[PDB]
Design an enzyme around this catalytic site. Structure first.
Site, short mmCIF file in Angstrom:
data_model
loop_
_atom_site.label_atom_id
_atom_site.label_comp_id
_atom_site.label_asym_id
_atom_site.label_seq_id
_atom_site.Cartn_x
_atom_site.Cartn_y
_atom_site.Cartn_z
N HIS A 41 0.80 -1.22 0.00
CA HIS A 41 0.00 0.00 0.00
C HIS A 41 0.84 1.27 0.00
CE1 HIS A 41 0.62 -0.50 4.43
NE2 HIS A 41 0.72 0.82 4.36
N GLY A 143 3.09 5.36 10.88
CA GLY A 143 4.40 5.15 10.30
C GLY A 143 5.09 3.87 10.72
N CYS A 145 3.96 0.73 9.81
CA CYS A 145 3.81 -0.30 8.80
C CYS A 145 5.17 -0.65 8.20
CB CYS A 145 2.85 0.17 7.70
SG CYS A 145 1.12 0.24 8.22
#
Ligand SMILES: *[C@@](O)(CO)[C@H](C[C@@H]1CCNC1=O)NC(=O)[C@@H](CC(C)C)NC(=O)c1cc2c(OC)cccc2[nH]1
Ligand SMILES: *[C@@](O)(CO)[C@H](C[C@@H]1CCNC1=O)NC(=O)[C@H](CC(C)C)NC(=O)c1cc2c(OC)cccc2[nH]1
EC number: 3.4.19.12
Lengths: 305, 303
Positions: A41, A143, A145
């Protein structure tokens, strides 16, 4: 002596964390040799995340659209591909700090260490367990991920988790290092709910063995039981059923203390049916289920890597 | 969101762990620049540990008596000094993995991360708190002496603890990087007891603020208490008094949640007098006190 939530040393995984930025979307990536693994993503904008077509969005991207950064040093992307919900980017430099590693899909109840990363910079380290509902009770902020969970065996680092989602209930969800999600979650900006969680029985038993090892053994009874009869009763208390692998890994703690697995089960089966009647185990009246038999052995035997 | 006992990344510290051996005694050492730090009882035999005259035993030792091993490489001891209970071993090679470091003496209630090592190899990492009685509730086995505790700020490592002893109660004691023990303990082979422990009040309040930030509010109430009236009850339950500084450090957590410190104190006071029934806070059945306001602010900022 002493029993604590212990995490593996994170030195080997630290040298593999990089920052992957596409447009204004940035997250963490894992730099192993000449490939960087990160959530797919990152190619998505704030609006596309609502309802995305990753195959459609990836065709519109090229190698020069990806910014990979080790510290403030750029790693030129020389190739890109998508495997499930994970994006793979080939870089022009082989990570000189690449350790002996392997990709593994852990099991519910199994524990692993999480290296919380932000902008490719490790910030914290903690241990967690893969709940029976395929969620993890972790600590993640915006932040995070791309942060990976791992286990260190011998000198091999077994990566098993990459962070993706935070459910409304505060729990977290992710995938393995092959992009395959743990549980029935999807990488989309949507409120998803996980199934009812249960207690990890194999870990609660390992905790009991940890107590018996430390002279605390009041809960032992002269009863035994079948693995089938115990699993049927355990489910009536929100306790996950035991598997063949569960009984096997309980062997070392069984031989060390001399108590058979099915004997301790009958002891735990009594603790669930009649309660604790005051009293505590390891100083706590709450049964702990986030310590695997390995965590009990490693921490009580000082296993190094 | 979420809250978990989180430790600093141990990479910068793993590159400094070596194995020091003297005779039949082996423990871990900290290799910084061209020096290696380790507990001084490594020079002791099984007999000397009972009552060691370290000054005497040290002068009777030579450089070749110390076997310093860094992985598969052996370091040559070209010097040896003593600073309290820490033995400083000079070597010919400088550790290239030596990060920016400093030697600080932690205060009671403050937290640090411990890198458990055995034979110079890291085994695990965890966060722990320096109890008010100057002990720590860690996880140490045989061969753990020499392990270090540390905090990391930016890229500077602040060393503050080196392991030495496990009390008969199962707790652990040690020194700072200057060889000064935390508490009234000595590095002799004797059963030693620590003073009566007290609960870190400011850490408990911060942990309650973390619980509120994560959706737990059953313990809250409408009452409020004065600083003195809360301290009177806290001290009655063996809780450290809450200082005006402690109240100030909790400011950021009070603003984020909108619950005043003295309002949180009313909740804690009620929890102390009425207990937690069968309920839990952040998955715990006991009031946690090993999380500092900073540790809470780090994980709960912006949530
Ligand atoms: C990563 O940083 C994205 O790069 C975060 C991780 C969370 C941020 C705060 N804590 C975390 O663990 N992921 C996201 O922001 C996305 C992931 C998708 C794009 C794969 N979204 C969520 O985690 C998300 C979306 C919702 C939602 O839908 C709007 C409702 C409720 C919760 C929720 N979480
Ligand atoms: C170091 O590994 C020794 O090199 C070791 C680590 C602790 C013991 C097991 N777990 C630990 O954390 N330290 C010791 O063995 C120290 C050695 C001193 C500083 C010379 N001593 C003890 O831990 C110790 C001695 C006694 C005792 O006496 C005899 C009675 C009761 C407890 C006890 N602990």
């Amino acid at each position: 002596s002493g029993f604590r939530k212990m995490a593996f040393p994170s030195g080997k995984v630290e040298g593999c964390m990089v920052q992957v930025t596409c447009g204004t979307t940035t997250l963490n990536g894992l730099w192993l040799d000449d490939v960087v693994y990160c959530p797919r993503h990152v190619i998505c904008t704030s609006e596309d995340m609502l309802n995305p077509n990753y195959e459609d969005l990836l065709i519109r991207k090229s190698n020069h659209n990806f910014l990979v950064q080790a510290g403030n040093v750029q790693l030129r992307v020389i190739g890109h591909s998508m495997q499930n919900c994970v994006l793979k980017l080939k870089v022009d430099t082989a990570n000189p700090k690449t350790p002996k590693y392997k990709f593994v899909r852990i099991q519910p109840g199994q524990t692993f260490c999480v290296l919380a990363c932000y902008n490719g910079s490790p910030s914290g380290v903690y241990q967690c367990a893969m709940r029976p509902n395929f969620t993890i009770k972790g600590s993640f902020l915006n932040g995070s991920c791309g942060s990976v969970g791992f286990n260190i065996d011998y000198d091999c680092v077994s990566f098993c988790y990459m962070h993706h989602m935070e459910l409304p209930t505060g729990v977290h969800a992710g995938t393995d290092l092959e992009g395959n999600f743990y549980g029935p979650f999807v990488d989309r900006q949507t409120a998803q709910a996980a199934g009812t969680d249960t207690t990890i029985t194999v870990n609660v038993l390992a905790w009991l063995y940890a107590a018996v090892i430390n002279g605390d053994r009041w809960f032992l009874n002269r009863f035994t039981t079948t693995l089938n009869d115990f699993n049927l009763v355990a489910m009536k208390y929100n306790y996950e059923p035991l598997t063949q692998d569960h009984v096997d890994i309980l062997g070392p703690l069984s031989a060390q203390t001399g108590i058979a697995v099915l004997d301790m089960c009958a002891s735990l089966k009594e603790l669930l049916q009649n309660g604790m009647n005051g009293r505590t185990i390891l100083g706590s009246a709450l049964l702990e289920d986030e310590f695997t038999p390995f965590d009990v052995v490693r921490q009580c035997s000082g296993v190094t890597f």
